[PDB]
UniProtKB/Swiss-Prot annotation, chain A:
Classification via PROSITE patterns: RIBOSOMAL_S8
Subunit structure: Part of the 30S ribosomal subunit. Contacts proteins S5 and S12.
Lineage: Bacteria, Pseudomonadati, Pseudomonadota, Gammaproteobacteria, Pseudomonadales
Keyword Cell membrane included in the entry's annotation: no
Record's protein name: Small ribosomal subunit protein uS8
Family: Belongs to the universal ribosomal protein uS8 family.
Alphabetical list of InterPro entries matching this protein: Ribosomal_uS8 (IPR000630), Ribosomal_uS8_CS (IPR047863), Ribosomal_uS8_sf (IPR035987)
Database matches in Gene3D superfamilies: 3.30.1370.30, 3.30.1490.10
GO biological process, alphabetically ordered: translation
UniProtKB/Swiss-Prot annotation, chain B:
Chain positions found as 3-methylthioaspartic acid: 88
Native organism: Pseudomonas aeruginosa (strain ATCC 15692 / DSM 22644 / CIP 104116 / JCM 14847 / LMG 12228 / 1C / PRS 101 / PAO1)
InterPro entries: NA-bd_OB-fold, Ribosomal_uS12, Ribosomal_uS12_bac
Basic residues: compositionally biased ranges: 112-121
NCBIfam families: rpsL_bact (TIGR00981)
Name assigned to this protein: Small ribosomal subunit protein uS12
Cited function: With S4 and S5 plays an important role in translational accuracy.
GO molecular function: rRNA binding; structural constituent of ribosome; tRNA binding
Stretches the record annotates as Disordered: 99-121
HAMAP family in UniProt: Ribosomal_uS12_B
Amino acid sequence: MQDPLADMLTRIRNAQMAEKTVVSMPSSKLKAAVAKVLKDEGYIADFQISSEVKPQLSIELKYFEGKPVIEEVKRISRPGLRQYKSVEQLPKVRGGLGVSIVSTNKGVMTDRAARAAGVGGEVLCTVF
Amino acid sequence: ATINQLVRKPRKRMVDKSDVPALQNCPQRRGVCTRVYTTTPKKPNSALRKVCRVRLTNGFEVSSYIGGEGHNLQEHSVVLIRGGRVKDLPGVRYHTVRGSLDTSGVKDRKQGRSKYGAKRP
RNA sequence: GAAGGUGCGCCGGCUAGGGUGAAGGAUUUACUCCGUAAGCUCUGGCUGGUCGAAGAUACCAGGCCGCUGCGACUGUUUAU
RNA sequence: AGUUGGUGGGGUAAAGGCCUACCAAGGCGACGAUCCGUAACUGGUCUGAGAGGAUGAUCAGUCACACUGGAACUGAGACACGGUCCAGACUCCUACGGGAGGCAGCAGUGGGGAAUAUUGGACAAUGGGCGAAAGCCUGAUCCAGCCAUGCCGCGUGUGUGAAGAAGGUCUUCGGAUUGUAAAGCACUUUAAGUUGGGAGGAAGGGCAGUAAGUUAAUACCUUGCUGUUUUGACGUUACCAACAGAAUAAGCACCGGCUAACUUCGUGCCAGCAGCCGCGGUAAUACGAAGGGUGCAAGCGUUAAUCGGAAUUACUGGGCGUAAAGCGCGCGUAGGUGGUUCAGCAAGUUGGAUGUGAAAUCCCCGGGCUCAACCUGGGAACUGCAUCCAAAACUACUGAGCUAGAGUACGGUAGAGGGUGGUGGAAUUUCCUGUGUAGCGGUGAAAUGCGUAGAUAUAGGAAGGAACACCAGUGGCGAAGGCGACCACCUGGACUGAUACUGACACUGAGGUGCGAAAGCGUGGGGAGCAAACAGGAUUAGAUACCCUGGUAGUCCACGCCGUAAACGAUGUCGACUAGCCGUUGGGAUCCUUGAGAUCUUAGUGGCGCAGCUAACGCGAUAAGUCGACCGCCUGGGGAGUACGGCCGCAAGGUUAAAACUCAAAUGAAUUGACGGGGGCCCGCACAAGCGGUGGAGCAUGUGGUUUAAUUCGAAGCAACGCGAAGA
RNA sequence: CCCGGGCCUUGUACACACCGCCCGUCACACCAUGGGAGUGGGUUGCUCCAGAAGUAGCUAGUCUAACCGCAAGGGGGACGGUUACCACGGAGUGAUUCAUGACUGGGGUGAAGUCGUAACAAGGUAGCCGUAGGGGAACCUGCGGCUGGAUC
Ligand SMILES: [Mg+2]
Ligand SMILES: [Mg+2]
Ligand SMILES: [Mg+2]
């Protein structure tokens, strides 16, 4: 309703508790772009956009040993409290093993790349 | 809890009132004894504790414990009172420092002499 | 009118408006309407000076406050 | 109300209601004005992992003050600490007419307090004022006096030394412990003492000469050198040598757990200890003492205070079904947050640069005190602000759209949704009449009561009020409170199907406003049953109750008020997602077109249940699971949802809402046991049926009581009393 | 059905285990506090009176070195007077805060006294919530609501 992005993570998180294979939900620039980071990071197998006037976003999910690959996904920059960090202040999820997706001005992209690119932005969510 | 509810009204910190209000942020005060008496402790204990009512230099009237065995204090005696209450004595919240001004130290004390104002022999 | 306080006479200088009102104009229809300078008349404002012991100067013209009993109140009554 | 602007003038070093004249009615305030209490502010300091919390000594920057109030004068600079004038309080002098003073400068005194120091030396250094200079003043400053007040450093000896000396303590009486600890033998002597030597903090000044500059000048003067003489308060210096001798130097707290460290003796709920748990009532590791040990050490403890632990105000980083906590429930203002696409902008956001963010301190690397404390070099930091330059993923804004949210148009469906009027049946009560004759009514049983004046019962008639049996259903509708006879009228919403339309118009919501059971209150009606109060009868030791007989307000209606409930699902609203299974209400679609069931879908309404959550109970698509927006609320129990004040009310009262004091717990869930005037099953001379007894009588025995010189002592419900006693 | 006992289940605020726990009034003591005719202080608002010195404006007047001048006297100044501002002080009337006050109300703590036994089991009339009335007291009763009630 008032946070379509957090709807994406919770839809993903609920499915992995229920051992579902694919999920469907309306798409957007942020939803598709965050799916880009997740797929290139290996947390999701693949994502497609059903290009119609009302587009969906479909994610097929990954399980390694039955346990879902994404152990935990947590929203950070909620609409009630938008969170902005500098390059030095960007979070490190689980000591660098995880990824904290940060929407910088060079597109949506991970915290590891943001430090390399030397740009901060809005810390959207943390993954592990 | 909501971050918006906190913005309007910040979290409030209670300040506990001192358990020694008559001492008034001082380590000790000087007072005179208005009444020396003995009182009975609560349910578990049974004894005759020596407590004296002290009129402090700031006008406060309080009762403080007299520690040790035997005391030489009576009416119109200048004493120094320190903090710390007595749990089995109702209404007593101060201690009388032995070995200062009129209240002499306990006689024949050998262990823990400094706490009771006892000379070294 | 709780209580309590300030000003107040007289003479100037400046100044704001009522009313009435020949003219003139209009309806130059008529016991008509609008309006009108001066003159009379009423109400102010801002300043200055001045006399006395005293300016609501005489006559005239609330004393006031606090607690409490009774009757709610205006009224009526033992003409004497 | 000079209040807020404007205009003219005045005034200031300078703008300005700074002042004034006139004109207008403005200005600030839930983004907290105004008022009350407190308070100098900052760099910084303490604590903390940090975020934060507490605080504003020393030192530094700013400010304000100078016995109290006010005022100006001079001056570049003051409305002036050691300046002026006036008024006031105090102290002092006086010849009574008048005068003098301001230690919150440095010492010092009296006083207050728990508490904070010498009536010191010198301008030697660095500054300041004056002066051409010499030089003078400087209680600034540099030093010295006192104080373990704090930080740091050193010492109070070193090795050997069994005799395991003596004594003390404990003891199992063997011994252990004090204990290499002492004694003894060797040894060094920091520091302290005495003596001797001994820097540096000193830059300079005077004098004379020389060189340069200048001027017409070789003079005067300025500057650079040369030689000489002089300046150290502290200080009798830091520092260095020699002598002597272990010689001059250890105390404090604690030992039950938290917490490192135990025995004995004395006491015996007394004395006392105590931060909490708590200890002590006759064999105390918890009191007092001794020995032993522990920790610390020229310090050791206690208090007072801050932070931490305390995630116990939770931003980092808590909760609200039952532990404290979801407003009774809607609507809605400010605010907070907002579906999706394109483009622009750049406030947020990001990176960089520049200026600033005083110095000291914090931190990092070094340097100097024999090291350290301390000083100091450089760097880092000051997480901030301002400007500029780049970027456009997201937010904000702008412009243009889209239909997923929201809403409108149409047909239909169900409903105790609400309001206004009528109408019906059953029943109760009251009254009238007939029959008819000793009870009716009530209770555990009675009695009050009703009845021979004819009750109850039965039949016929009449009046009146209230509620709507069956239907009826974890059924329906409503925001909640609530709504049950039927019909007519007025009217709200929901559900349902497709198409059509707007195009984010949304969510939540402090204030605010509206509705809100029952009781209650006001005015007027009404009143059958029921029934607070009240009366009588019972029961009971008593019974201001339970039970019975009556019975008033009230319950009913209209119009007002109240504004509270265990107003509960003890669960705020809205949106999305997450296995299933079994019912039910209103629809829709497809198979069955079935006659008559089945499968999907939707809005409700229930019962199980995977995962997940939970302290547990339990929740579990109607979440208390995974999230997001917003709001309300909680911070131990009692005091207390009380007092006081405010608002509301006719009142009763409601709402908002403390503190002192007091307690170490209140509390939730669950387990074991025990218990129940809870339930189920079963047994025993437990009951039931009987046999014979005790208690009545005389005698034997024991016990209590009494008495005694003793009537020896113990046994005290069952489970003591012909008991120990199987024999005074 | 009386007593005692055994098993299962249920409720419990009991664990000293119902010979339990526990409520309230009254009697006594102590402590803190509310109300209270009042009484005594602090601070402060408003409306006024007052007006020393000083500053500025005006001039009943008196005096006067710098300038001008005829050497008369002018210009300017000083003092005096006077007005404006204003401190002290005074008056009235409020507000607030502190301390006390005969008496009075509740609250807490007590070594335990009197009267009951209200709740906890179906606590022996299920309990509790709101409200109203009543009663020495816990409490009782009515009306509505709830289960945070036993048996079934
Ligand atoms: Mg009288
Ligand atoms: Mg009368
Ligand atoms: Mg008469």
